[PDB]
Design an enzyme around this catalytic site. Structure first.
Site, PDB file in Angstrom:
ATOM      1  N   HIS A 122      62.685   1.726 -32.542  1.00 21.64           N
ATOM      2  CA  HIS A 122      61.395   1.794 -31.857  1.00 21.64           C
ATOM      3  C   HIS A 122      60.797   3.195 -31.885  1.00 21.64           C
ATOM      4  O   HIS A 122      61.488   4.190 -32.139  1.00 21.64           O
ATOM      5  CB  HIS A 122      61.492   1.427 -30.391  1.00 21.64           C
ATOM      6  CG  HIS A 122      62.061   0.081 -30.148  1.00 21.64           C
ATOM      7  ND1 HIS A 122      61.601  -1.053 -30.786  1.00 21.64           N
ATOM      8  CD2 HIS A 122      63.056  -0.316 -29.331  1.00 21.64           C
ATOM      9  CE1 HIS A 122      62.289  -2.093 -30.365  1.00 21.64           C
ATOM     10  NE2 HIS A 122      63.172  -1.667 -29.482  1.00 21.64           N
ATOM     11  N   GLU A 168      58.861   2.441 -24.144  1.00 28.49           N
ATOM     12  CA  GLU A 168      59.516   1.870 -25.297  1.00 28.49           C
ATOM     13  C   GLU A 168      58.478   1.017 -25.991  1.00 28.49           C
ATOM     14  O   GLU A 168      58.202  -0.096 -25.534  1.00 28.49           O
ATOM     15  CB  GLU A 168      60.734   1.044 -24.883  1.00 28.49           C
ATOM     16  CG  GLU A 168      61.442   0.334 -26.031  1.00 28.49           C
ATOM     17  CD  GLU A 168      62.739  -0.325 -25.584  1.00 28.49           C
ATOM     18  OE1 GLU A 168      62.637  -1.251 -24.759  1.00 28.49           O
ATOM     19  OE2 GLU A 168      63.848   0.063 -26.041  1.00 28.49           O
ATOM     20  N   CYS A 182      75.156 -14.874 -26.755  1.00 26.32           N
ATOM     21  CA  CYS A 182      74.778 -13.464 -26.710  1.00 26.32           C
ATOM     22  C   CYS A 182      75.148 -12.782 -28.026  1.00 26.32           C
ATOM     23  O   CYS A 182      76.332 -12.560 -28.313  1.00 26.32           O
ATOM     24  CB  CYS A 182      75.445 -12.758 -25.533  1.00 26.32           C
ATOM     25  SG  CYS A 182      74.834 -11.053 -25.269  1.00 26.32           S
ATOM     26  N   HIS A 231      67.824  -1.885 -32.400  1.00 26.79           N
ATOM     27  CA  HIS A 231      66.500  -1.661 -31.830  1.00 26.79           C
ATOM     28  C   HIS A 231      66.033  -0.337 -32.421  1.00 26.79           C
ATOM     29  O   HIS A 231      66.403   0.726 -31.923  1.00 26.79           O
ATOM     30  CB  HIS A 231      66.550  -1.630 -30.311  1.00 26.79           C
ATOM     31  CG  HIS A 231      67.304  -2.776 -29.718  1.00 26.79           C
ATOM     32  ND1 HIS A 231      66.683  -3.933 -29.300  1.00 26.79           N
ATOM     33  CD2 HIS A 231      68.631  -2.966 -29.517  1.00 26.79           C
ATOM     34  CE1 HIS A 231      67.590  -4.776 -28.847  1.00 26.79           C
ATOM     35  NE2 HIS A 231      68.782  -4.214 -28.968  1.00 26.79           N
ATOM     36  N   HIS A 275      69.126   2.136 -31.934  1.00 27.56           N
ATOM     37  CA  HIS A 275      70.286   2.127 -31.061  1.00 27.56           C
ATOM     38  C   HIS A 275      70.877   0.729 -30.992  1.00 27.56           C
ATOM     39  O   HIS A 275      70.265  -0.256 -31.418  1.00 27.56           O
ATOM     40  CB  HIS A 275      69.943   2.645 -29.661  1.00 27.56           C
ATOM     41  CG  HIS A 275      68.867   1.872 -28.968  1.00 27.56           C
ATOM     42  ND1 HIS A 275      69.122   0.716 -28.264  1.00 27.56           N
ATOM     43  CD2 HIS A 275      67.542   2.114 -28.834  1.00 27.56           C
ATOM     44  CE1 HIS A 275      67.998   0.263 -27.744  1.00 27.56           C
ATOM     45  NE2 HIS A 275      67.023   1.093 -28.074  1.00 27.56           N
ATOM     46  N   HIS A 319      65.211  10.163 -35.318  1.00 31.31           N
ATOM     47  CA  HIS A 319      65.828   9.764 -36.595  1.00 31.31           C
ATOM     48  C   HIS A 319      67.357   9.839 -36.530  1.00 31.31           C
ATOM     49  O   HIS A 319      68.044  10.163 -37.494  1.00 31.31           O
ATOM     50  CB  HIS A 319      65.236  10.570 -37.750  1.00 31.31           C
ATOM     51  CG  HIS A 319      63.833  10.164 -38.077  1.00 31.31           C
ATOM     52  ND1 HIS A 319      62.755  10.516 -37.292  1.00 31.31           N
ATOM     53  CD2 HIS A 319      63.331   9.405 -39.080  1.00 31.31           C
ATOM     54  CE1 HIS A 319      61.651  10.004 -37.804  1.00 31.31           C
ATOM     55  NE2 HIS A 319      61.972   9.322 -38.885  1.00 31.31           N
TER      56      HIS A 319
END
Ligand SMILES: [Zn+2]
Ligand SMILES: [Zn+2]
Ligand SMILES: [Zn+2]
Ligand SMILES: [Zn+2]
Ligand SMILES: [Zn+2]
Ligand SMILES: [Zn+2]
Ligand SMILES: [Zn+2]
Ligand SMILES: [Zn+2]
Ligand SMILES: [Zn+2]
Ligand SMILES: [Zn+2]
Ligand SMILES: [Zn+2]
Ligand SMILES: [Zn+2]
Ligand SMILES: [Zn+2]
Ligand SMILES: [Zn+2]
Ligand SMILES: [Zn+2]
Ligand SMILES: [Zn+2]
Lengths: 182, 182, 169, 169, 182, 169, 182, 169
Positions: free
Chosen positions: E31, E129, E24, E29, E14, E69
């Site tokens: 996971h 997570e 920033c 990510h 994501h 996925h």
């Protein structure tokens, strides 16, 4: 307040005596025990900090390790059994209650509660008995006389149990008012 | 509100100083620590989201990793010890409290609480100290002066600890009002 | 062809010449081979022989460790720091812990030491065998080059038991 | 070349001549090799053959264990203590438990016993192989030198099943 | 009432978009996620039982496996990124919130809450997570507009995500009033 | 004959040409053999040599991975997606991760790489040995066919340290 | 009061019957179950102590092991299925509710609650169903008639299930008032 | 010499002729050896080849299993019981599950099946190798003696994919 948990373990054999019921047999219980001591601290002064290679955990560990490779029996068990207990193991502990995971959690609470006169307060003890379950004591359980009143003179440690203490007069010191950590 | 937990770990040595009691010896404690940061969020705005490869967790991780392969000592320890500490490890942290798992949970709470000025609120910190137990801080523990007051200027990080920060002026920025995540 | 594993833990600080300072929880697996099971070489908790081995192994616990061949004025700072120290004849690491713990257990002991596994926190382990102990390239181990401190020696059941071991007794 | 592991637990007290008394949770891994998978040698829970093996293995559970060659007046104190006792032809330890459990399972049984692992609390384990069973230096194992008590024998599915095993049947 | 927990897992990538802050950076990510669905049931009627190879868990699993996925992006992300997302993965999910473990726990709560119209009530969702932490949603978090309002039309599943559903009209059925388990 | 295991984690996305996109937590076991324990090849956290190895291994973390020989207009979409990307000379999978991590650690390094285990979430693992690295049938590995991105290279302690490694230095 | 947990396990197959819904199929569920019995004790008298090789846990274990290598079906299932069940397994249990992890937690609570007439009180039962989740019963769940009323005569154990009991008249004894542990 | 482990679970009931009925959680480790890593034999989740293997393996999940050579009027009672059944050419156990899952995965597949480990609840496991598959003493395995039910075959991605496998395609 602020929750502290401290982990102990010990290996023990103990006696559960029976009823006069025709099917109720006497049993012995050798197990691995794990002990969670749960403290609440309002104050992290040095004298009631609990840490390895300090005095105050040293005494709590020494009392807790008294039950390790020891046998525990009831005071009010039959004296032929009790005398067979003392022949069996030179590490023996005489208890004012019948030994169980349930009563160990009360006994270990009380012992830690008595040691913490030297703020810091025993909240709870959980004794896990091998893979079969746990007992959790709180403060109401300690002063429950239906569960069996706990005084320091009702727990009698063996000579050989006292032999492994860092201080041989540790338990007698707490029978008096003798304040531990100056 | 909504509970968030975030997991950190660090490896540390620290000093517990003694009493003037005749049996109380000084001890050092190298351990593995695990840290649960517990957050409550009323609002998942971007500026106080906590996630890897973002700025705000980057600062919390950098402060938390300050204690990794560092030694911690008390400010009010004997200065021969403190000078032996700074010779011993170029990664050193000077603390306004005696270092323990207990005080780490207060210190890490406070550091995370100060970083979250940039809704999102530190609820609690749990510091697990190897296999021997944990300490859990809440908000009342932070403002407890009997536990020892925590200000940002009372935690002094080493030069070499500052050397590994993503921003070298991170801690000085929070000593001022300097708001972190625009 | 009996495999015995005995399990130990200790919590250690040590040094490596940035020079870096290492505070970790350690786990030890001591792997033994047995063919007699006669009582004098028996490893069990509240007797005697594991009492030697656990005392020598718990010597590393809440102590610092340093090299002999570290610089002297940091060695004083190592043993100013606390009175639990162990002087080591190699530079302390988890690799060198697995050799040292092997060597200490072998010198104590038909039980022979087959292997020692030392786990360093969650970052992995080192596993010594006997051939690792017999390298001068890894740093030769004799008994007298390990020096325990005065207060490490205080905690032992016999405080003399290392000084016995270097002699015949 | 089929490896089968079957898993057992028991909670035991025993003796070692300080003389020391040992109350531990134990775990057993029984390792088998198979080349037939014919039904009479099948190990599965609510049938028969593992019923023999688990009864003999749960015999050790909430019982005490002692040597034959312990002193008699402590052997009475062993079996005054509770009516669950097992007399053993070697001095009971987790090393000797792994040999005994191997020997009991082998005598029950193309499934042969490859190895037995007995874990003693969190302090480690002993692993017997077949060559460990064939030492008189470790203490020779025959069936009649293991004596179960009257009330250990009470709990079994057949109380006669050991006394069957020492004969042909 | 009576607590039920049901365990799900999914594997996801994501997007977290950035500030206009100079430090920033945008991050992705990938996971492993573990999902605790916490139900309270006042009634174990058949139509809102949750079990494998039944219809109602079949739909909850199918919605939950939509995130497996798949890639998740914000609706209000930059459309060059969003178009690169749809090129990247034919399994994509468009979300009315920026995707996080925090918002997944709100999204999975809401999806399960909407499916349970067919007594049985979503109490809480915990999304773990990887090894870095968890977020726990409760009912107040779902209706929090500061967290971002969740409607069924704000979650847009890909065609290829819909391709693996047991019923292709599952999600459209719940956009209408269409009651699931007769 | 010293076995050293060092443990790593990373959190990765990657591609396989339905074409399928894979976001997983990974665990790495790096297995080393040692016969010197000289300080320049020492693997320990806050020194230097594991600092190279962990930087190259954490390069895979919150990055996407793609084939070289994937189609170009999806490769732009791979590196439009975020600035943490790694170009790989084989198609990325946990099988190919175990070969690549072996190859990177071997090129860094008497410590040699014995094996690499890469665990992909809870669905299992792949374990490379040295013979797996020496197949052109598995896809030949050289250093320059692994291309890290500009911002993957940004996070490293030395940003130049890969470009050093391809030369002698 | 004082919390006691006791751990049990069993291996089971059971039937979930379907709707007249066109997509709802009948399913069977062979799983591994783990059972937490949660007790509160105001009194550790011998007659309601729970421990291995004593009578009272002996009965609770014997009732709990009734579900091991047994099949469970609903009373109100179709009798062709029920007769195929009894052919299938000589260990069978007829239940006044449709069998589930949810109803097992109610059933095991009730069985333990009925056995504890012989202070000591069933607080809660948690039944963990393989790796997919758990159900937790409390006292309100037992007396919930919307969940399905539990009486001792509504649970019918097989002959072969009774064959393995320590006492063959155990369950009939509790159908009467017959007090267990003298 | 690449070891790949892939992990599976299933929740099964089955029969053994007291005749006894067995409801357990199972775990499968499928152990593969690899020397090509070419894409057609690749095992990964949302592609194709593990899609065959997981469909055949999840076929055992919330199904009952019975012998062919069980008595007919209990075989009807097996498949009256639910429409998820698998007819097996051997008597179902965790020993025979490890052979069957090996045989199914081998027939699907340079990836070859090295071993299969099937864990039966907490009571242990069986581990098949290739030599276990090649015994007629353990019960010979061909494809057509495994019969999946009509509704087991319903859940598959292709419902025809077993009937393909028995032919060349
Ligand atoms: Zn009684
Ligand atoms: Zn017991
Ligand atoms: Zn003091
Ligand atoms: Zn410490
Ligand atoms: Zn250097
Ligand atoms: Zn270190
Ligand atoms: Zn002796
Ligand atoms: Zn012992
Ligand atoms: Zn930002
Ligand atoms: Zn992330
Ligand atoms: Zn393809
Ligand atoms: Zn994947
Ligand atoms: Zn239905
Ligand atoms: Zn099920
Ligand atoms: Zn038979
Ligand atoms: Zn079974």
């Amino acid at each position: 307040h602020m929750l502290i948990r401290k982990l102990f373990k010990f290996e023990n054999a103990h006696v559960v005596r029976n009823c006069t019921s025709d099917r109720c047999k006497r049993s012995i219980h050798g197990h691995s025990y794990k002990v969670e001591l749960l403290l609440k601290a309002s104050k992290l002064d040095h004298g009631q900090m609990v840490y390895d290679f300090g005095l105050l955990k040293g005494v709590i560990k020494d009392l807790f390790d008294s039950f390790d490779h020891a046998i525990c029996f009831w005071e009010k068990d039959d004296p032929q059994y009790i005398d067979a207990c003392k022949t069996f193991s030179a590490r023996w502990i005489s208890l004012p209650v019948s030994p169980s995971a349930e009563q160990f959690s009360r006994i270990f609470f009380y012992l830690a509660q008595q040691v913490l006169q030297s703020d810091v307060e025993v909240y709870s003890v959980i004794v896990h008995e091998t893979d079969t379950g746990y007992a959790q004591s709180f403060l109401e359980d300690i002063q429950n006389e239906q569960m069996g009143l706990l005084n320091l003179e009702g727990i009698i440690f063996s000579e050989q149990v006292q032999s492994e203490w860092a201080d041989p007069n540790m338990y007698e010191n707490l029978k008096q008012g003798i304040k531990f950590h100056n």
